[PDB]
PDB file of N, CA, C and O in Angstrom:
ATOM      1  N   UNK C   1       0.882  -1.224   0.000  1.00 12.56           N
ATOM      2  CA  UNK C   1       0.000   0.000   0.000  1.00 12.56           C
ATOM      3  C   UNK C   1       0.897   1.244   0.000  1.00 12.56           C
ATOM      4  O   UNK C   1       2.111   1.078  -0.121  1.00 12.56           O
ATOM      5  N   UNK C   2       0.290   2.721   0.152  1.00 13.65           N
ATOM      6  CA  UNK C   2       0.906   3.815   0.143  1.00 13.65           C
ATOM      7  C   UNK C   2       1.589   3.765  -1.095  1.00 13.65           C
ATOM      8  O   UNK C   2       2.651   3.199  -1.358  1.00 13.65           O
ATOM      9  N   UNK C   3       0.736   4.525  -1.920  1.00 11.71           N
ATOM     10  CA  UNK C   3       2.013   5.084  -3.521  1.00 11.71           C
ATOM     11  C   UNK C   3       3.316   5.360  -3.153  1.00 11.71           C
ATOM     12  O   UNK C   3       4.029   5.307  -4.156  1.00 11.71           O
ATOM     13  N   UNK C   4       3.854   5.593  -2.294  1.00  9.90           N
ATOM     14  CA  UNK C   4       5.332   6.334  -1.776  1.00  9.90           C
ATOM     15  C   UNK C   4       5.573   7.616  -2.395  1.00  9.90           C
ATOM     16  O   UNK C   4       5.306   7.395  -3.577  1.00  9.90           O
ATOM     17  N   UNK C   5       5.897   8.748  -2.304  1.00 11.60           N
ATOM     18  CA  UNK C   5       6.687   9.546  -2.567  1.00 11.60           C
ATOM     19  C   UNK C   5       7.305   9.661  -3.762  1.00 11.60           C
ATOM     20  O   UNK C   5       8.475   9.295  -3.646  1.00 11.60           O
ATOM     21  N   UNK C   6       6.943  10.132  -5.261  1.00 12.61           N
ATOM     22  CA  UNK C   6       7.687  10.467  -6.419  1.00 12.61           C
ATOM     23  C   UNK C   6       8.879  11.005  -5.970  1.00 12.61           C
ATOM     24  O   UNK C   6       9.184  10.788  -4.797  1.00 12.61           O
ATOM     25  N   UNK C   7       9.955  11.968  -6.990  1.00 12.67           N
ATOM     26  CA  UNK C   7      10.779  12.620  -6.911  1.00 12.67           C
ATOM     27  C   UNK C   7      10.152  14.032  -5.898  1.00 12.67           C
ATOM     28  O   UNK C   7       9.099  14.289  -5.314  1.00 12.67           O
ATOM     29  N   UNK C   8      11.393  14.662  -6.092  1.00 11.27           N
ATOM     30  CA  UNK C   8      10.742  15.807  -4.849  1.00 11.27           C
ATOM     31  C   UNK C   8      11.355  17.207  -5.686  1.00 11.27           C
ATOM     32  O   UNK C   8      11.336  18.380  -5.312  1.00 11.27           O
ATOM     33  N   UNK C   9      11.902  16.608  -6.959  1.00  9.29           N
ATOM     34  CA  UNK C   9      12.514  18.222  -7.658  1.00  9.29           C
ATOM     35  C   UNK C   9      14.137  17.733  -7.472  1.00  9.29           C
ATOM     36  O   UNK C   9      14.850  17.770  -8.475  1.00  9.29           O
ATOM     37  N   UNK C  10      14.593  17.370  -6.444  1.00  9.76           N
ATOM     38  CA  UNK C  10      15.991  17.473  -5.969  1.00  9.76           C
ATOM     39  C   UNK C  10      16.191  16.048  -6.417  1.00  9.76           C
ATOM     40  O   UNK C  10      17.302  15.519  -6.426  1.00  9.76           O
ATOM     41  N   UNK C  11      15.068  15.434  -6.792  1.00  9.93           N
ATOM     42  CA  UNK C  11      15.679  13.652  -7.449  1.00  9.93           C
ATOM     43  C   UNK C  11      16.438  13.855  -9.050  1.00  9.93           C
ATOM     44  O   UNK C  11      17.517  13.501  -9.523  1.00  9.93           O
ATOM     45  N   UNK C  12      15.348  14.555  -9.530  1.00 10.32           N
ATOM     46  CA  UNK C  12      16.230  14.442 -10.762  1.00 10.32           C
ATOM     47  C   UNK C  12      17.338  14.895 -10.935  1.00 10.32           C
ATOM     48  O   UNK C  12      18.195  14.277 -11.567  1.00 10.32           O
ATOM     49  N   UNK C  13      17.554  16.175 -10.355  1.00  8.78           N
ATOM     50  CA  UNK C  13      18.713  16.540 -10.352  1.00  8.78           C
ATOM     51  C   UNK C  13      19.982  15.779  -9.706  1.00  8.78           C
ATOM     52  O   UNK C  13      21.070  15.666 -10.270  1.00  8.78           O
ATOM     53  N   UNK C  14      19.734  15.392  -8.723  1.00  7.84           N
ATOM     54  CA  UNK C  14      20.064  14.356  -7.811  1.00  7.84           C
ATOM     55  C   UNK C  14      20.872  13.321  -8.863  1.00  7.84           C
ATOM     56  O   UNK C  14      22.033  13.342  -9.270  1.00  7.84           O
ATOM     57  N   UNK C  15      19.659  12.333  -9.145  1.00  5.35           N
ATOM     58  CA  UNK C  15      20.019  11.651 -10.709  1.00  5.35           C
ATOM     59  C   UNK C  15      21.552  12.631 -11.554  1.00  5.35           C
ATOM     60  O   UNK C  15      22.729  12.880 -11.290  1.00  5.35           O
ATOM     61  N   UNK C  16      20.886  12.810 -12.284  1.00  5.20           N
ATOM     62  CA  UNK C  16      21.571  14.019 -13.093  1.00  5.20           C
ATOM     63  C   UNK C  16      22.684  13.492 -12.768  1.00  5.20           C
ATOM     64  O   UNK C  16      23.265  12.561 -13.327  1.00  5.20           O
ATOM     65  N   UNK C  17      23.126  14.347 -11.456  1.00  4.36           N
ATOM     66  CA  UNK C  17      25.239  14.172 -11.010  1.00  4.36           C
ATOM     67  C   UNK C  17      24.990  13.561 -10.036  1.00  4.36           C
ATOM     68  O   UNK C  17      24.927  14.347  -9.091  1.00  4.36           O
ATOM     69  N   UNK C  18      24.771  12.348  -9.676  1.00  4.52           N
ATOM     70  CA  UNK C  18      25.532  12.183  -8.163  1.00  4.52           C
ATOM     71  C   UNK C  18      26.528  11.029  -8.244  1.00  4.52           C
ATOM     72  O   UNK C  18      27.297  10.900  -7.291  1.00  4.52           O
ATOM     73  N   UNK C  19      26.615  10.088  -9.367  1.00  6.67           N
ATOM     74  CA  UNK C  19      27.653   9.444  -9.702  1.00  6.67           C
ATOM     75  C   UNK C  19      29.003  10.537  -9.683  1.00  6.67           C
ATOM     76  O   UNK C  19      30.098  10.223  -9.214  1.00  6.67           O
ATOM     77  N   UNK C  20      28.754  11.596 -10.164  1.00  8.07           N
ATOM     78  CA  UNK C  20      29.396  12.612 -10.216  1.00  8.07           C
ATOM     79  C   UNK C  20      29.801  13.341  -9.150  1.00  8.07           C
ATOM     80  O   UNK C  20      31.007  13.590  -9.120  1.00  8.07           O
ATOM     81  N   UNK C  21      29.175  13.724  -8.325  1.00  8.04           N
ATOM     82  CA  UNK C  21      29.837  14.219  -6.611  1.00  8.04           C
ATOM     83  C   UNK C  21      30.602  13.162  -5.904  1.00  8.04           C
ATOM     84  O   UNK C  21      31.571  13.340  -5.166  1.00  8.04           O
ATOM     85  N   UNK C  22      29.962  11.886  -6.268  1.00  9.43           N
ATOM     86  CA  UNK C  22      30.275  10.486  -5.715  1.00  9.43           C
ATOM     87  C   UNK C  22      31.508  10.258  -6.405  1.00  9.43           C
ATOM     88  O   UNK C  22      32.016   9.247  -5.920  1.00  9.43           O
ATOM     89  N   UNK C  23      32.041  10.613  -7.084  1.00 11.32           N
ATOM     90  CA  UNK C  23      33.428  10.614  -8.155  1.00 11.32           C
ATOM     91  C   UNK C  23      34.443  11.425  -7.337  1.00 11.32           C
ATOM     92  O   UNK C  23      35.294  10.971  -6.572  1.00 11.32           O
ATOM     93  N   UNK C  24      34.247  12.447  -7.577  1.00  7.48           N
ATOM     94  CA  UNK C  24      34.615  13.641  -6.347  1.00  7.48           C
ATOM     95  C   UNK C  24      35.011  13.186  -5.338  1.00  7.48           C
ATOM     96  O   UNK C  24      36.178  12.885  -5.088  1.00  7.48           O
ATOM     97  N   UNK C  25      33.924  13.068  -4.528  1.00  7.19           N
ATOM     98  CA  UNK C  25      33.647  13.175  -3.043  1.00  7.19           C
ATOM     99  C   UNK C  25      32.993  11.561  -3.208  1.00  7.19           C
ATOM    100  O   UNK C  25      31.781  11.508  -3.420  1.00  7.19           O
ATOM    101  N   UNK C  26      33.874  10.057  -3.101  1.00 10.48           N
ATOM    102  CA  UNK C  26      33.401   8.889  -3.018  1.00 10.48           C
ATOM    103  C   UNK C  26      33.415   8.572  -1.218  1.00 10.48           C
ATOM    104  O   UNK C  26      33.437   7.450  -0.712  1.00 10.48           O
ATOM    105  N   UNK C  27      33.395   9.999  -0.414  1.00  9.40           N
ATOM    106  CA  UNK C  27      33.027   9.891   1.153  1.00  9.40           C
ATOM    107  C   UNK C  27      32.123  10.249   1.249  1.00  9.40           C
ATOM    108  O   UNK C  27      32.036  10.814   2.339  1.00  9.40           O
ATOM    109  N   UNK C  28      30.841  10.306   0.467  1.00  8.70           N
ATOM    110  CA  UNK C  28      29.425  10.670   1.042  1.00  8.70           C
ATOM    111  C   UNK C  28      28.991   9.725   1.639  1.00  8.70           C
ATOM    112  O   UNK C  28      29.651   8.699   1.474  1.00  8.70           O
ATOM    113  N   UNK C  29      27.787   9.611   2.540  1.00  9.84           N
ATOM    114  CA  UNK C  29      26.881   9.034   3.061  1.00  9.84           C
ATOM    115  C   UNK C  29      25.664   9.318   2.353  1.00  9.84           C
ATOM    116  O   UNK C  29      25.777  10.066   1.382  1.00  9.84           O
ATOM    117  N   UNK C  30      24.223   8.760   2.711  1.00  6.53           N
ATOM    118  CA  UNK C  30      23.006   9.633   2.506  1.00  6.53           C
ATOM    119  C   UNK C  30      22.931  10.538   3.564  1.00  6.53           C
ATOM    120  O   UNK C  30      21.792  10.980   3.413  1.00  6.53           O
ATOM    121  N   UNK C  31      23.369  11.064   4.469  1.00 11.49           N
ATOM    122  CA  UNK C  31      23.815  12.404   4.592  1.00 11.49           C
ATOM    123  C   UNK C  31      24.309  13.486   4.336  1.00 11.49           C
ATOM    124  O   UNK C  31      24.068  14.598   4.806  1.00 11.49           O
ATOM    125  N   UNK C  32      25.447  12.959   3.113  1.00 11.60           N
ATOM    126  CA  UNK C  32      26.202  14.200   2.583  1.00 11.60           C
ATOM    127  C   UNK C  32      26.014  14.052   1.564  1.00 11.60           C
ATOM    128  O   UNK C  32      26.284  15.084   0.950  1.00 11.60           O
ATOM    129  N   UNK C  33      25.588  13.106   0.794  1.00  7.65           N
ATOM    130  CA  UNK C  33      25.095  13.115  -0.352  1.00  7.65           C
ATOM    131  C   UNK C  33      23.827  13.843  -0.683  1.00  7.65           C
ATOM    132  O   UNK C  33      23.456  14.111  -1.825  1.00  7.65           O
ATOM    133  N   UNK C  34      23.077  14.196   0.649  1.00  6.59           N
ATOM    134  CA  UNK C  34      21.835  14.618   0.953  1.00  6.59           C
ATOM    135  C   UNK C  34      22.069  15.802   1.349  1.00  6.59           C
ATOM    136  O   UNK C  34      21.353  16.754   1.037  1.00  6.59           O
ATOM    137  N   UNK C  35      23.291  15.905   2.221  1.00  6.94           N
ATOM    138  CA  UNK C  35      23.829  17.843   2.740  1.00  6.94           C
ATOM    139  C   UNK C  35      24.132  18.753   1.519  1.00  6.94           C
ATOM    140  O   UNK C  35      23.794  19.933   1.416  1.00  6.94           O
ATOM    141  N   UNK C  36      25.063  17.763   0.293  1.00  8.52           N
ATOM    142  CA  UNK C  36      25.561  18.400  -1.334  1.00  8.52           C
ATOM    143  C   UNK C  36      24.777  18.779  -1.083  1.00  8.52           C
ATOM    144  O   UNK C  36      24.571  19.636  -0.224  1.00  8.52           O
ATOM    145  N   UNK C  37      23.694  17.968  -2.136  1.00  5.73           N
ATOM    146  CA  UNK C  37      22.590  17.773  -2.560  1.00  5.73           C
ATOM    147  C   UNK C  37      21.674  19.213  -2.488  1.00  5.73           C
ATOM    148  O   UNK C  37      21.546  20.191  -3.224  1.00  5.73           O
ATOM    149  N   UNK C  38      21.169  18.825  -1.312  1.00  3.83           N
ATOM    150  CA  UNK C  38      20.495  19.735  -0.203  1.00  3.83           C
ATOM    151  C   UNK C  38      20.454  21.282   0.148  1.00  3.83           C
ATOM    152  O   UNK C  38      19.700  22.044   0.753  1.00  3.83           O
ATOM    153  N   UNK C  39      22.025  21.375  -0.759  1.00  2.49           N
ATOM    154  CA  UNK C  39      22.872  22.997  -1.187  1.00  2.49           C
ATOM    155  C   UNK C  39      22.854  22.934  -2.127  1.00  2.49           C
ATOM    156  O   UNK C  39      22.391  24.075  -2.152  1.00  2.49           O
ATOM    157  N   UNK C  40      22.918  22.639  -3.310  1.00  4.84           N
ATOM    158  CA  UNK C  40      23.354  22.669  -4.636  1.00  4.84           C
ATOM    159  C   UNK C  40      21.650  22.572  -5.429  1.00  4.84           C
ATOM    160  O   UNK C  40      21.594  22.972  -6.592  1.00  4.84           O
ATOM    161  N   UNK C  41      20.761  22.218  -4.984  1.00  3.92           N
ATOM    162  CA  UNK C  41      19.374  22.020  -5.311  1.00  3.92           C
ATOM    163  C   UNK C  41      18.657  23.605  -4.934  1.00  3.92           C
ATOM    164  O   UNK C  41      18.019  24.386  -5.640  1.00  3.92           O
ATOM    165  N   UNK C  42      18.992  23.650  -3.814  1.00  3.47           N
ATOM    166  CA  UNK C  42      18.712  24.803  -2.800  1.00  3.47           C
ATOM    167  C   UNK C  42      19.464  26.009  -3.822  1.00  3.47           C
ATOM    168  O   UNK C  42      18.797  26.974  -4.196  1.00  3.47           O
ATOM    169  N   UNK C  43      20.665  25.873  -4.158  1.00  2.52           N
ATOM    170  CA  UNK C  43      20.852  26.847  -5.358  1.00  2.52           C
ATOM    171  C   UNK C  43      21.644  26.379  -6.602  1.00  2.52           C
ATOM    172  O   UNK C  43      22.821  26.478  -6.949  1.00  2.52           O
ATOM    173  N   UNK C  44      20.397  25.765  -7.197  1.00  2.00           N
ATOM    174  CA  UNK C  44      20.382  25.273  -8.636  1.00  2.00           C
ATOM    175  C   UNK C  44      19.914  26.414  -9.534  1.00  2.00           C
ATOM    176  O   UNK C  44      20.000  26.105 -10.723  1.00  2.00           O
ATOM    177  N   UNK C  45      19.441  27.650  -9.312  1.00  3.24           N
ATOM    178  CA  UNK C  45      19.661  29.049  -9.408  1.00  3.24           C
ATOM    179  C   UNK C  45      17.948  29.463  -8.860  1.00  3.24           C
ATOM    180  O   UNK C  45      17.438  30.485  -8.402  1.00  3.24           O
ATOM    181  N   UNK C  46      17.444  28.109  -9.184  1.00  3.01           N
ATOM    182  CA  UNK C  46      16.001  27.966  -8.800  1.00  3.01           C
ATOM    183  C   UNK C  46      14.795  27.977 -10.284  1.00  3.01           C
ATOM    184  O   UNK C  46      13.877  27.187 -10.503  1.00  3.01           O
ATOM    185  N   UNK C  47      15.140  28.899 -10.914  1.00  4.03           N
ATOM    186  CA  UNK C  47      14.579  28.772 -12.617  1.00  4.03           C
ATOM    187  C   UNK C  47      15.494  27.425 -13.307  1.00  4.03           C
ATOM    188  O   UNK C  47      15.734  27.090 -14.467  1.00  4.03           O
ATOM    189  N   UNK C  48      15.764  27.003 -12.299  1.00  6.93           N
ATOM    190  CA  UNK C  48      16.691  25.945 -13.029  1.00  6.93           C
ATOM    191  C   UNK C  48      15.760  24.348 -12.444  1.00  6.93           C
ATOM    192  O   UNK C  48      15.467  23.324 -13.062  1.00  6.93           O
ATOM    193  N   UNK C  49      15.591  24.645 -11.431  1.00  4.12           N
ATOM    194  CA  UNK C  49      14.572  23.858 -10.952  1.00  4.12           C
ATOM    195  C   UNK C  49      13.008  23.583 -11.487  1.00  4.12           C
ATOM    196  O   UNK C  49      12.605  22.455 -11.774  1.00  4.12           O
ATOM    197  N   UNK C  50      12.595  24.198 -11.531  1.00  3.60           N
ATOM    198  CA  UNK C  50      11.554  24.835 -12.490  1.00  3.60           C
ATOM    199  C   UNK C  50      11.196  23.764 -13.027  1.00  3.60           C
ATOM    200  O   UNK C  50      10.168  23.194 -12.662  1.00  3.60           O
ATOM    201  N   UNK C  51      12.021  23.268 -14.046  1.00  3.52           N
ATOM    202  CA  UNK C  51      11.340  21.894 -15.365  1.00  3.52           C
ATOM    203  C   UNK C  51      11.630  20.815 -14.705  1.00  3.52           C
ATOM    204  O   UNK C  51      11.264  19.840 -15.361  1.00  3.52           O
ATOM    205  N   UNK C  52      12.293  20.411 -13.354  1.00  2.00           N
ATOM    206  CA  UNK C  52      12.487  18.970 -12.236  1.00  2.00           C
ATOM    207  C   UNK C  52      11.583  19.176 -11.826  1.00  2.00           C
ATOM    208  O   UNK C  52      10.876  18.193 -11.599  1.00  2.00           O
ATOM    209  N   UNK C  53      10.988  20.657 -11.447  1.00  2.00           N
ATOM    210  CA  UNK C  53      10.188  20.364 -10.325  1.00  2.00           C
ATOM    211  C   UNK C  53       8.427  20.254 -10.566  1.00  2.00           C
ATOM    212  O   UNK C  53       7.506  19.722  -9.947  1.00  2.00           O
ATOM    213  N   UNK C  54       8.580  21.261 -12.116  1.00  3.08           N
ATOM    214  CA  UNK C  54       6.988  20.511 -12.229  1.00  3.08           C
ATOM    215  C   UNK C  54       6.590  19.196 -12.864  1.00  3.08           C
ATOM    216  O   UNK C  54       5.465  18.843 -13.219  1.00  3.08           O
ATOM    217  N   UNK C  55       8.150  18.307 -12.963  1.00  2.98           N
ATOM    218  CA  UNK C  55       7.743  16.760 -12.952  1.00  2.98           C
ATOM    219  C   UNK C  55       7.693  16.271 -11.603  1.00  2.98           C
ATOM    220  O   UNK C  55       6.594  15.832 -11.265  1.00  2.98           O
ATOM    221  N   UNK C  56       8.515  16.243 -10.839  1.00  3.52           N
ATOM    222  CA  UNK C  56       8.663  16.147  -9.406  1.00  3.52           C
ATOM    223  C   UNK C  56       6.845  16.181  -8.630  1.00  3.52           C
ATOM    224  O   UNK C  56       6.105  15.245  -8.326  1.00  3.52           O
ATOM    225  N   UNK C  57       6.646  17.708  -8.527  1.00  5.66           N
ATOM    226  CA  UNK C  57       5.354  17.985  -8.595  1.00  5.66           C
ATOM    227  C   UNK C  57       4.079  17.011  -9.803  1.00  5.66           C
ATOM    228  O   UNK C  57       3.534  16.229  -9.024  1.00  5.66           O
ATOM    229  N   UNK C  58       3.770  16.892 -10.510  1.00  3.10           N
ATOM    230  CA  UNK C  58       3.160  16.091 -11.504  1.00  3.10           C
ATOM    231  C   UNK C  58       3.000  14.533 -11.084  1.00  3.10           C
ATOM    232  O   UNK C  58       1.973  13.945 -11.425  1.00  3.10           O
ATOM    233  N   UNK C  59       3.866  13.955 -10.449  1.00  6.50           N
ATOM    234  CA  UNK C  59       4.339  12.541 -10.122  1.00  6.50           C
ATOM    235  C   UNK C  59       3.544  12.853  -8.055  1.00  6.50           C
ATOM    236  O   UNK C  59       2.525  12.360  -7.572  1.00  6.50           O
ATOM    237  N   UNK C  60       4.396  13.660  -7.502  1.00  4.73           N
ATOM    238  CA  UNK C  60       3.938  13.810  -6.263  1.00  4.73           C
ATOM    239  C   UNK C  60       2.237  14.408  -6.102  1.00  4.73           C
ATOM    240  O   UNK C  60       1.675  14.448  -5.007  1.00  4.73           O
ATOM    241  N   UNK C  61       1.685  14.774  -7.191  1.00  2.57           N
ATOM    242  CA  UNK C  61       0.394  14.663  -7.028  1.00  2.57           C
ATOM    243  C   UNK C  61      -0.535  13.890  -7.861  1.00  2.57           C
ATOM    244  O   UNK C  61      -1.686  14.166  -8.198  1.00  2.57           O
ATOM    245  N   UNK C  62       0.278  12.748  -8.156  1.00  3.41           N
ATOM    246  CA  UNK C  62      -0.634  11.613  -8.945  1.00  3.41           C
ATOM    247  C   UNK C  62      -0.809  10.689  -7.526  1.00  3.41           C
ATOM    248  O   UNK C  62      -1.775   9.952  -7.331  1.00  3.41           O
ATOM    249  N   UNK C  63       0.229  10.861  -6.654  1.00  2.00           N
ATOM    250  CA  UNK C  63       0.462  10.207  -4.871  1.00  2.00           C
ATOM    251  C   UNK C  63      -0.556  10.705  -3.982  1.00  2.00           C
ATOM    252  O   UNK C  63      -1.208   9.966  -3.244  1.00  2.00           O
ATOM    253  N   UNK C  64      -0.736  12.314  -4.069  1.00  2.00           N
ATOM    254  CA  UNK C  64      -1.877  12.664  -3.703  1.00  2.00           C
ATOM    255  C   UNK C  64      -2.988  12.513  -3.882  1.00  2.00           C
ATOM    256  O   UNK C  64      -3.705  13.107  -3.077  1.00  2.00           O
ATOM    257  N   UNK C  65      -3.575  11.832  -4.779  1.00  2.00           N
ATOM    258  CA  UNK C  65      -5.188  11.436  -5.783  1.00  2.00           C
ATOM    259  C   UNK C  65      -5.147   9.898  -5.017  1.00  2.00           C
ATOM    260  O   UNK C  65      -6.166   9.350  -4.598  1.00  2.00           O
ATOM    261  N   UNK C  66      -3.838   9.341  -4.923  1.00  2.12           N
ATOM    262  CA  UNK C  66      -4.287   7.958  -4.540  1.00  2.12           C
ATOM    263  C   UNK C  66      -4.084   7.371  -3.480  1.00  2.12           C
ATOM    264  O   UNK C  66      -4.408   6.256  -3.072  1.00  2.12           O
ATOM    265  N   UNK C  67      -3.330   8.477  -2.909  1.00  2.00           N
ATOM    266  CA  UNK C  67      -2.949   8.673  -1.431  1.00  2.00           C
ATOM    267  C   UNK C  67      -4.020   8.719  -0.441  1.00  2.00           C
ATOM    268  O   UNK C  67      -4.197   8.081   0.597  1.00  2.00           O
ATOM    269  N   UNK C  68      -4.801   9.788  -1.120  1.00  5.69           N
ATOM    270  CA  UNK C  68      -5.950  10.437  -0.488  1.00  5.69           C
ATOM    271  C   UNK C  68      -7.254   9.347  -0.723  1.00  5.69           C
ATOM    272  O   UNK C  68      -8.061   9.030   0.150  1.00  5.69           O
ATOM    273  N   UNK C  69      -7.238   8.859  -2.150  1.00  5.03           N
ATOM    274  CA  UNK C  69      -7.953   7.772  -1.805  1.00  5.03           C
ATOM    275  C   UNK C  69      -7.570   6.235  -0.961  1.00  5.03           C
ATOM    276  O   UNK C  69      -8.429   5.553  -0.401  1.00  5.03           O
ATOM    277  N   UNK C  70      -6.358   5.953  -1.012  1.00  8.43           N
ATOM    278  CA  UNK C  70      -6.183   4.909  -0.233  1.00  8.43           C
ATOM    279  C   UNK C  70      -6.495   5.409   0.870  1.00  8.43           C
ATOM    280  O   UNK C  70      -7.564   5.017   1.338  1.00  8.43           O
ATOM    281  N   UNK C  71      -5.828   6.264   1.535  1.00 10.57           N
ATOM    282  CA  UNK C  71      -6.357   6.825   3.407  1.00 10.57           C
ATOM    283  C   UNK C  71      -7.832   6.832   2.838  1.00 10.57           C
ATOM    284  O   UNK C  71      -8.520   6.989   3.847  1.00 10.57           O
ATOM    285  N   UNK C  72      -8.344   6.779   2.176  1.00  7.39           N
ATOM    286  CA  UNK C  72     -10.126   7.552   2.410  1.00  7.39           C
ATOM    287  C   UNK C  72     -10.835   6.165   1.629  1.00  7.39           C
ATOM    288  O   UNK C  72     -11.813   6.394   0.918  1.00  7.39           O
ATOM    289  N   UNK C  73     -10.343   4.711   1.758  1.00  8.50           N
ATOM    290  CA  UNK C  73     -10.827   3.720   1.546  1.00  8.50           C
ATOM    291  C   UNK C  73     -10.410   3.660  -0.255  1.00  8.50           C
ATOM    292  O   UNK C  73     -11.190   3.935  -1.167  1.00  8.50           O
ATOM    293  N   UNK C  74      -9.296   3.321  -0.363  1.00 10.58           N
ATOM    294  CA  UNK C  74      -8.849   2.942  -2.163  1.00 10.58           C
ATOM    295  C   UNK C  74      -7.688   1.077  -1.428  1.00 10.58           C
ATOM    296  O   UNK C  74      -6.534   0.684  -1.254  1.00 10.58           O
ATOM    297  N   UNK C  75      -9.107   0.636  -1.292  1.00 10.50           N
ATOM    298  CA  UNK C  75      -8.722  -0.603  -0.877  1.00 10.50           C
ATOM    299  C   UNK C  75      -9.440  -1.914  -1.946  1.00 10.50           C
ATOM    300  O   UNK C  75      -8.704  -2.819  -2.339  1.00 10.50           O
ATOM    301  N   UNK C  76     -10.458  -1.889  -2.213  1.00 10.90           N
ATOM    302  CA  UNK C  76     -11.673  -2.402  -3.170  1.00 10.90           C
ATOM    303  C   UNK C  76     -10.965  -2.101  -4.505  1.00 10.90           C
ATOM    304  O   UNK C  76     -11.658  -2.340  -5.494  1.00 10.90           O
ATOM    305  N   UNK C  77      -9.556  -1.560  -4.767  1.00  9.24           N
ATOM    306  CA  UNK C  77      -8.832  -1.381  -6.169  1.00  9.24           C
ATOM    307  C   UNK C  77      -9.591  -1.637  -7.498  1.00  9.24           C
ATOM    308  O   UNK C  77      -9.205  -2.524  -8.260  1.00  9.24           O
ATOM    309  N   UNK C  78     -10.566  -0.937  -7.753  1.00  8.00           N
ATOM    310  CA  UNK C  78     -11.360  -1.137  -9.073  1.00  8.00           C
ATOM    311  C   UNK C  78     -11.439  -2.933  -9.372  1.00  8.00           C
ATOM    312  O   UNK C  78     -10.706  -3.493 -10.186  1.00  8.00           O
ATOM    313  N   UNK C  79     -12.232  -3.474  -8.729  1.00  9.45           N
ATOM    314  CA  UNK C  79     -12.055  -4.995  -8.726  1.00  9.45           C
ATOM    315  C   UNK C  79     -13.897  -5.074  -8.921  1.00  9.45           C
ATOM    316  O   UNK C  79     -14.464  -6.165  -8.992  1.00  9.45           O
TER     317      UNK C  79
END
């Protein structure tokens, strides 16, 4: 159950380089891979974000439609 969580904007980009920071910097954790991250998303200039994030967004509210119906009885799955 629970759709989980699409991207969040910072996935694709994420995607994008992180083999690439991880090249760099092969001492990340999902902490610092998540601290980069976390800065470099934060200023990706932000219009740069923009076309991640209204897929990001698009995907995270297809979660919301079924989210909202699973919490609100999307159990009976069109059966």
């Amino acid at each position: 159950n629970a759709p989980k969580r699409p991207p969040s904007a910072f996935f694709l980009f994420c995607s994008e380089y992180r083999p690439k920071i991880k090249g760099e910097h092969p001492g990340l954790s999902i902490g610092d891979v998540a601290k980069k991250l976390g800065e470099m998303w934060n200023n990706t200039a932000a219009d740069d974000k923009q076309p991640y994030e209204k897929k990001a967004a698009k995907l995270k509210e297809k979660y919301e439609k079924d989210i909202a119906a699973y919490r609100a009885k999307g159990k009976p799955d069109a059966a």
